[PDB]
Structures are given as C-alpha cells and as structure tokens.
Design a protein around this ligand. Structure first.
Ligand SMILES: [Co+2]
Ligand SMILES: [Fe+2]
Ligand SMILES: [Fe+2]
Lengths: 293, 296
C-alpha cells in the first residue's frame, strides 16, 4: 500500500500514529547547488535526527514529508534519517510553486507533467527505488494562476492512474484551497483523497467547514511555527471543530524547519476540554489511515 | 588576471580567439535535481567535447560560458570537458532570472547577494578551486523588476570589489539592455566592463549604437538561432555596424552549442564579412582585442 523511504511497503492499516505534514529539511535546489557553502549537511542531519527520535519517543510511528520540487526534496538525505532512526517516512512527488513553473515547462503539457509524478510513484525517486506515496501542490497569495492550475490538473491525472492521495498547500485567507478542491473534484478525484493544507491559519471557521463539508480533510498543520495565528487561537478552532463533529475530517501537524509542540501544548489542551483519547486517535491514526487507503 | 576552469590563471593579453557567450549545458536546477531520468549526461558530454573541439580547429582558444544560477551551472561538468578538449574555459557567477528570486532571497539583502558572487570570484565555485572570471545578470520581457534590479546592484558591488566584467542577458525589443547599463553605470561601473547581451536580435540599429556610444560592448551573440532574426538579417546589422566603425565595441557569439552550432560564424558570418570589405584586423579586433580589454 504505502511506500516508505528505506524500508519496504507497509499496509495502510499499520501506518500508526502519524504526523501528516512535516519537513525534514527545506531549500531552493538552485541555491544549494550553486552555493553549497551556505549549508551545513552535518548540522542539518543532526538536528533532524534529534527531532525525529524525540517524536518517536512520544509515540509517532510515521512522518509524511511533503517536500517536493521547489523546496528541495532529496531522497538520499531522507533514507539517511530513516536508517539513523527507524521512522516510517513517506516521501511524495509533485511541484511546489505559487506563480510560474520553471522554464523547462514552457510548451510542456499537463500530461507530460503528470508523467513526472507517475514516474516518481511507479519507477521511483531521483534514481532510487524509494517511491512517492502521494502528490503535493501549492497555491498561496497569488491565487490560482495558469501554471498553478496546470500543476493541480496533473495531480488529478496522477491520482487517477495511481490512486495515491494529494496534499495541498494553500493560503487560508484567499479561497485558494476551496479552488483546489473544486478543480480536483471536477476532474474526478475522490474528495476524500485530498488534504487541503494550512486551514489552521484562519479563525474563519465557516470557510474551513465549507471545505470539510465537500468531503476533503482540513489541515490544521502549522502548529508552533505560529507567525500566522498564535498557538492559542489554533488550539480553539481545533477544539471548536471537534465539538461540532468534524473530527473525521481533521488532520494536525507542524510544518517545521519543534516537531513535538502538539504533545506539549495541543494534545494536553484538548484533553482538558473533554476530548477523549478516541478523538485524538481518530485524528492521528484513523484519518491518516483512510486518507492512504 | 583571468581564472580558468581546470588550469592556472592566464594573462588578459593571452585569451586568443574568444567566443564570449557559449553554454556547454543548460538546465533548470530544480527539474534535474528532482527528475534526473529526463537527462542523459553521457550524451551531453560527447556533444560538449565534440562541439568544443570543432571550435578549436577554427582556432578558438578561449570560450566564456555564462551558465549561472537558474540555468544549471556545474563546474564539475565544465572541468570534465576541459580535460577532454584542452580549452581555456572561463566560468562565471551571478543570477539568471526574469521576475522573482528564489524563496531563499526573501527579505535578504543586496550585499548578502553580492557576497555569493564575491565568494565564487575570490574563494571558488561550488567549493572547488575554479574561480569565476565575470558576473552574469539577466532581464527580459518582464522588465526591470524589483528582484532583477537587486541582482544588478549585487553585480555592481562585485565589479567594484574584484573588477571582473559583467555580461548581461537582455531583451533587444524593450530597452532592458540599456537600463542594465544605466543602473550599473549609475552605481559607477565602468561602461567598458559591461557586455550587454542579445542586441543582435533586433533590426533597430539606432538602439544598438546608443549602448555602444555610452561605452559598453554590444552582444551580437545568438548566431544561428533563427527564431529571433535570421542569419542573413544579423550579418548586415553586423556589417553596417562595422562600416560605421563600431568594431571596437562589437562582440559576436552563438549562445549555445547544437543549421545552428558552436561554429556557424566560421562557415558563414566570417566569410560574409570578408567578401564585404572587412579585413583580418577588424575581426581580430572583435574576437581577440575586444575580449582582451573587457577582461582587463
Ligand atoms: Co541569454
Ligand atoms: Fe509544508
Ligand atoms: Fe546565453
């Protein structure tokens, strides 16, 4: 079912407690490659190994890292951190852009772009046998631009052909994620194979529900890296969302570059307001489980 | 004087017959990093070796390759091909973009950029001892945008700090080339340390000269890419310019390997000029002497 980095495919049912949106490392491939002297491979690798193994202590069995083209996916560093920790790591494919595709994509087709994603998820990633387990796409303040729309559409095709889910990045303040659901569902993707990202950044609880009402998971997924909304206002929308029955559509993560702030703040908090272990299990085991099923 | 790839430095007076703008290889860093199955480095290598050596037989001694960030500069590929051919290859540093910078440069400073250029000139390129002899900037249809502007200034700074010249990519139809000059020159870069590129892509010979008159080299540098102006309209704008005595300001090149190749000018443009009243001194002005002073 779910390919992992380093280890061999697991069954959807054994994903376990999951962090659905976390970055081991992020960069611009062009910058890293032209100017290696800006980066410390050993520091980076130390920091990610410590963060991860802390999370494994707290009960996390699986991290899904949606680092793709444009924010510096490296499957090799990834399998390094797997082998140094024993974590279940799901790598994805896709393209992260907010306006234009790189020049290579001028006069390329939607289908040609999807063949990239299919390659990654059937043959493998950057020449290895580690396979992609989902597709990532993005839009932010610029909105649904032409090239952003191509990428969205190629995700649609990759999902049809392979049935791997799709994770999005979106701007909670400008209707991007609604548009992303609209276009994917229009093209025939199961709404429930979609995670609409970063909705945790707004107070506007109606907009969030609007999306969850159309059958997709809603991403409350930048806890702690809280330049969007204080961790106190997140932990509240989250609670409110749980009280009105949306647990079956809620996913929680950090989007990091700590990875355990939800054990220190959010999960403690939710318990205090009468959220039982069964709803936290729904969010971190069952929702991941079905998303990948 | 001029740092080279796979070889000791050489004097400004020793470049020989130069092609001032030719790319061994060009690709988007993001794409190749993510999807290397799309590229075959073995074919890229044979082609680069072959084309380079064909260029050596028409008596090309030095090639300048303005592949920098955004179009897939790799000095490991360059040095590898330098040893298969024995060319004097001059690598560079700078940024190639037409609108926005990578997310990394968000909130970051003109001097922090300028430092990444100074790094590749003074310390080395991609942590190797091969050093950069010039700085490449670019601008095109989207105009002089905020981030394009920043990259120009960072180039200014690197020219003041190590006095390497600045090659530019510009659009010949919209006055970007003259702004790159203006701004660079405002910042107090010596006009004669600026080659402004791709002016051979236009008829408007009035616009060409203006840039030559303000002291900067003009790049008639896309020979064989017909999609722009055909070879016969190019050779002509070129001829006129020479007959008007713009020789000391003219640089000629193809802008890329491979009837388009790294030697199209030898089989066509040079013979054409020679049967139209252009002597062996005026071409030597263009391919020996103009580079000479550019890198000096
Ligand atoms: Co150019
Ligand atoms: Fe993210
Ligand atoms: Fe070029």
């Amino acid at each position: 079912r779910i390919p992992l980095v380093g280890k061999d495919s697991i069954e959807s049912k054994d994903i376990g407690f999951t962090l659905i949106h976390e970055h081991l490392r992020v960069f611009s491939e062009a910058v890293r490659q032209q100017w290696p002297h800006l980066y410390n491979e050993d520091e980076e690798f130390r920091n990610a190994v410590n963060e991860v193994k802390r999370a494994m202590q707290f009960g996390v069995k699986t991290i899904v890292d949606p680092t793709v083209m444009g924010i510096g996916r490296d499957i090799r560093f990834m399998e390094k951190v797997v082998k140094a920790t024993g974590i279940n790591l799901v790598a994805g494919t896709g393209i992260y852009i907010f306006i234009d595709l790189p020049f290579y994509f001028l006069n390329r087709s939607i289908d040609e772009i999807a063949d990239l994603f299919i390659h990654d998820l059937k043959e493998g990633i950057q020449g290895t046998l580690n396979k992609a387990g989902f597709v990532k796409i993005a839009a932010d303040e610029p909105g649904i631009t032409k090239d952003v729309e191509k990428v969205i559409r190629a995700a649609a095709i990759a999902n049809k052909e392979t049935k791997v889910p799709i994770i999005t990045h979106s701007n909670a303040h400008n209707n991007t994620g609604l548009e992303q659901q609209r276009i994917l569902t229009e093209e025939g993707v199961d709404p429930g194979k979609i995670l609409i990202g970063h909705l945790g950044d707004t107070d506007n609880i109606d907009y969030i529900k609007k999306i969850a009402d159309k059958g997709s998971f809603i991403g409350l997924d930048r806890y702690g890296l809280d330049m969007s909304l204080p961790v106190d206002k997140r932990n509240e929308t989250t609670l409110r969302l749980i009280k009105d029955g949306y647990s079956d559509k809620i996913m929680i993560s950090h989007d990091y570059c700590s990875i355990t702030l939800i054990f220190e703040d959010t999960i403690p908090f939710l318990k205090r307001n009468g959220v039982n272990e069964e709803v936290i299990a729904t969010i971190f085991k069952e929702n991941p489980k079905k998303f990948f099923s």
